[PDB]
Scaffold this motif. Sequence first.
Motif, PDB file in Angstrom:
ATOM      1  N   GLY A 141       8.349 -63.324  10.479  1.00 28.15           N
ATOM      2  CA  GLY A 141       9.352 -62.263   9.819  1.00 28.15           C
ATOM      3  C   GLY A 141       8.605 -60.980   9.391  1.00 28.15           C
ATOM      4  N   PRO A 142       9.284 -59.919   9.151  1.00 25.84           N
ATOM      5  CA  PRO A 142       8.975 -58.635   8.826  1.00 25.84           C
ATOM      6  C   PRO A 142       8.432 -58.535   7.285  1.00 25.84           C
ATOM      7  CG  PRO A 142      11.424 -58.741   8.471  1.00 25.84           C
ATOM      8  CD  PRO A 142      11.023 -60.050   8.975  1.00 25.84           C
ATOM      9  N   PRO A 143       7.469 -57.571   7.189  1.00 29.02           N
ATOM     10  CA  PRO A 143       6.730 -57.535   5.647  1.00 29.02           C
ATOM     11  C   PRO A 143       8.046 -57.387   4.603  1.00 29.02           C
ATOM     12  CG  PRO A 143       5.993 -55.755   6.926  1.00 29.02           C
ATOM     13  CD  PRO A 143       7.178 -56.590   7.707  1.00 29.02           C
ATOM     14  N   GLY A 144       7.485 -57.429   3.359  1.00 29.37           N
ATOM     15  CA  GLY A 144       8.428 -57.560   2.226  1.00 29.37           C
ATOM     16  C   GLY A 144       8.585 -55.894   1.980  1.00 29.37           C
ATOM     17  N   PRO A 145       9.633 -55.564   0.825  1.00 27.92           N
ATOM     18  CA  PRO A 145       9.678 -54.143   0.499  1.00 27.92           C
ATOM     19  C   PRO A 145       8.562 -53.558  -0.397  1.00 27.92           C
ATOM     20  CG  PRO A 145      11.220 -55.825  -0.711  1.00 27.92           C
ATOM     21  CD  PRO A 145      10.356 -56.466  -0.001  1.00 27.92           C
ATOM     22  N   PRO A 146       8.612 -52.227  -0.334  1.00 25.07           N
ATOM     23  CA  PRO A 146       7.600 -51.593  -1.267  1.00 25.07           C
ATOM     24  C   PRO A 146       7.829 -51.886  -2.685  1.00 25.07           C
ATOM     25  CG  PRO A 146       8.745 -49.772   0.186  1.00 25.07           C
ATOM     26  CD  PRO A 146       9.572 -51.048   0.070  1.00 25.07           C
ATOM     27  N   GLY A 147       6.810 -52.142  -3.529  1.00 14.78           N
ATOM     28  CA  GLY A 147       6.916 -52.348  -4.873  1.00 14.78           C
ATOM     29  C   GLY A 147       7.495 -51.374  -5.700  1.00 14.78           C
ATOM     30  N   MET A 148       7.853 -51.970  -6.886  1.00  8.83           N
ATOM     31  CA  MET A 148       8.827 -50.874  -7.771  1.00  8.83           C
ATOM     32  C   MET A 148       7.545 -49.832  -8.278  1.00  8.83           C
ATOM     33  SD  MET A 148      11.501 -52.415 -10.276  1.00  8.83           S
ATOM     34  CE  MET A 148      11.701 -50.598 -11.131  1.00  8.83           C
ATOM     35  N   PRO A 149       8.359 -48.563  -8.689  1.00  8.27           N
ATOM     36  CA  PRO A 149       7.435 -47.604  -9.185  1.00  8.27           C
ATOM     37  C   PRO A 149       6.644 -47.719 -10.324  1.00  8.27           C
ATOM     38  CG  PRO A 149       9.583 -46.466  -8.781  1.00  8.27           C
ATOM     39  CD  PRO A 149       9.790 -47.812  -8.619  1.00  8.27           C
ATOM     40  N   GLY A 150       5.504 -47.059 -10.753  1.00  8.34           N
ATOM     41  CA  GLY A 150       4.622 -47.435 -11.559  1.00  8.34           C
ATOM     42  C   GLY A 150       5.039 -47.050 -13.032  1.00  8.34           C
ATOM     43  N   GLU A 151       4.453 -47.704 -13.940  1.00  4.08           N
ATOM     44  CA  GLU A 151       4.731 -47.467 -15.512  1.00  4.08           C
ATOM     45  C   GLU A 151       4.504 -45.825 -15.828  1.00  4.08           C
ATOM     46  OE1 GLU A 151       6.377 -49.047 -18.426  1.00  4.08           O
ATOM     47  OE2 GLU A 151       7.230 -49.530 -16.813  1.00  4.08           O
ATOM     48  N   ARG A 152       5.324 -45.363 -16.760  1.00 11.30           N
ATOM     49  CA  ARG A 152       5.006 -43.895 -17.187  1.00 11.30           C
ATOM     50  C   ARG A 152       3.643 -44.109 -17.941  1.00 11.30           C
ATOM     51  NH1 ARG A 152       8.322 -40.106 -21.355  1.00 11.30           N
ATOM     52  NH2 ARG A 152       7.441 -38.098 -20.592  1.00 11.30           N
ATOM     53  N   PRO A 168       4.075 -60.792   5.976  1.00 16.75           N
ATOM     54  CA  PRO A 168       2.939 -60.376   4.775  1.00 16.75           C
ATOM     55  C   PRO A 168       3.664 -59.491   3.830  1.00 16.75           C
ATOM     56  CG  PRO A 168       2.826 -58.810   6.722  1.00 16.75           C
ATOM     57  CD  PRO A 168       3.687 -59.854   6.968  1.00 16.75           C
ATOM     58  N   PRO A 180       4.210 -52.930   0.911  1.00 16.63           N
ATOM     59  CA  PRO A 180       3.257 -52.296   0.224  1.00 16.63           C
ATOM     60  C   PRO A 180       3.380 -51.955  -1.289  1.00 16.63           C
ATOM     61  CG  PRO A 180       4.677 -50.792   1.764  1.00 16.63           C
ATOM     62  CD  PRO A 180       5.357 -52.355   1.647  1.00 16.63           C
ATOM     63  N   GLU A 221       5.618 -42.071 -13.433  1.00 18.63           N
ATOM     64  CA  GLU A 221       5.764 -40.579 -14.144  1.00 18.63           C
ATOM     65  C   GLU A 221       4.647 -40.229 -14.876  1.00 18.63           C
ATOM     66  OE1 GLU A 221       9.112 -40.813 -16.890  1.00 18.63           O
ATOM     67  OE2 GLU A 221       8.903 -38.770 -17.244  1.00 18.63           O
ATOM     68  N   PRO A 266      10.987 -65.828   7.361  1.00 21.07           N
ATOM     69  CA  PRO A 266      11.466 -64.663   6.732  1.00 21.07           C
ATOM     70  C   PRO A 266      10.673 -63.523   6.252  1.00 21.07           C
ATOM     71  CG  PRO A 266      11.302 -66.615   5.143  1.00 21.07           C
ATOM     72  CD  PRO A 266      10.906 -67.029   6.411  1.00 21.07           C
ATOM     73  N   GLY A 324       7.990 -61.190   3.803  1.00 24.23           N
ATOM     74  CA  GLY A 324       6.919 -61.387   2.795  1.00 24.23           C
ATOM     75  C   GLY A 324       7.462 -60.753   1.500  1.00 24.23           C
ATOM     76  N   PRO A 325       6.833 -61.095   0.439  1.00 26.23           N
ATOM     77  CA  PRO A 325       7.074 -60.690  -0.907  1.00 26.23           C
ATOM     78  C   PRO A 325       6.867 -59.231  -1.110  1.00 26.23           C
ATOM     79  CG  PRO A 325       5.157 -61.911  -1.449  1.00 26.23           C
ATOM     80  CD  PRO A 325       5.518 -61.665   0.238  1.00 26.23           C
ATOM     81  N   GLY A 341       5.356 -55.738  -2.544  1.00 24.16           N
ATOM     82  CA  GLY A 341       3.999 -55.326  -3.025  1.00 24.16           C
ATOM     83  C   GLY A 341       3.958 -54.937  -4.540  1.00 24.16           C
ATOM     84  N   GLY A 377       3.575 -49.808  -8.689  1.00 22.60           N
ATOM     85  CA  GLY A 377       2.573 -48.378  -8.287  1.00 22.60           C
ATOM     86  C   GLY A 377       1.836 -48.007  -9.458  1.00 22.60           C
TER      87      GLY A 377
END
Lengths: 25, 26, 25, 216, 216
Positions: free
Chosen positions: A1-12, B3, B6, B12, C1, C3-4, C6, C9
């Motif tokens: 399968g394709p890779p997962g989505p990008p992770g959520m934005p970092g904390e302030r 996998p 990213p 912020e 399917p 991957g999880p 990432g 950030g």
Amino acid sequence: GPPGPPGMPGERGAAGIAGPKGPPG
Amino acid sequence: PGPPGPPGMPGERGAAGIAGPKGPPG
Amino acid sequence: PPGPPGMPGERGAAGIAGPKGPPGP
Amino acid sequence: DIVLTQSPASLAVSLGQRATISCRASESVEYFGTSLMQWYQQKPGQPPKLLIYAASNVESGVPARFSGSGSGTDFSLNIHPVEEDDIAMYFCQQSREVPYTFGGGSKLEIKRADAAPTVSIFPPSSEQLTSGGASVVCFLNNFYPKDINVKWKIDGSERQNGVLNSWTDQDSKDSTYSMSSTLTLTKDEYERHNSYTCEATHKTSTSPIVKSFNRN
Amino acid sequence: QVQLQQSGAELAKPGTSVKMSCKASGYTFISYWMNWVKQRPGQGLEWIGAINPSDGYTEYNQKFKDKAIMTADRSSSTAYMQLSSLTSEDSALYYCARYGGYFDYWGQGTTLTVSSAKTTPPSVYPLAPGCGDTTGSSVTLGCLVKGYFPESVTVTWSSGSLSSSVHTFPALLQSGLYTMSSSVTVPSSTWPSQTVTCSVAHPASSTTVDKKLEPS
């Protein structure tokens, strides 16, 4: 399968230190 | 399966620190 | 399917330092 | 800067009683809605530990026994009820004006029942004499309350200086105070005289406590 | 968990420079302003300055502006501080502490001592009870560490056999050299039939001294 989505934005980050007292009138 | 995705974008930047209180008397 | 997701950030930078106060009366 | 002032200097309370400390600020330290005072605890040989921030709020992981209130320019820290763990220095500081400034400190000692102190007197070691110095230690252990005065006396006659003294402090386990007191002579001086004695005046004894040792 | 690994203790001749470390771990280094504090024993906490590490930007208390030079390395997740032209007053104990509205997490503190006085191993002198003396259910012994510098020194009795019944009195400064002492109390039955020895470690001078306590 394709890779997962990008992770959520970092904390302030932490708030900066307070400034020093204002000059005299 | 596939996998993992990213890393997320960076967060912020923190709030600016407060100004200092009023100065001595004119 | 697929991957999880990432990891989250990196956290924002510490806030800028506080400025000088207002002048007195 | 901003000048914070703590009261009282040191205070003694009995376990289970209530202890209150007050921090007073040269200028009030309130930004818009809320005041910016934090209370810190510090124990010997250790960095400070945060207890309270913003006066009312309590740092996660600090027991409820620690309640702190203030507002405006005047704040106070309260503990109910005091425990053996809680022997410490307590500091107040503000995050309102740089440069950030801390209190002066307030020592917290436990109140306990008055205890007489065992005393021991020691001659100078032969080893030291070979070196050509001679000193006379006198130990004073397991007493309370803290106030005590030691007095040295050679051949019935007092000597005021050359003496050094050191104290221990109440502890997570020991609540008594112990004190060392060295008296430091030169060999020749030591040799000339004969009888030596440390004298101890403390609450617990109307009559001053003494241990003496005749040379030879 | 969040941790602030501070560098080793330090001794320096006055007028020399000194650099200090505070390896940070367990949180994003960038995101929190890091601060530095100065504690001189028996006196309050003095804010030196703070450095945001995401950019290297810094802010100093007026007092320390000429003395203190704050630095940071983003790769190392380390904060540094440099003190130059050292002068005794500078001799003290320095904490690095993280700031998120308050000083929630501290390091353990590097300890600075500034003096001409050179490193000296300690003379250790046993304190066997008086030649002329009356035994009790309890006998108190001790031994006396004298003429050592610089300050960190530790004493263990009967090879760590006794933790309780042991009194360690803090050091004093006697004619530009340090002096400390330790008390221990066993039962009268125990000594001198058993062996009681004080072992004295002064890791500064790479020296340990072991003394078997003997009666007369």
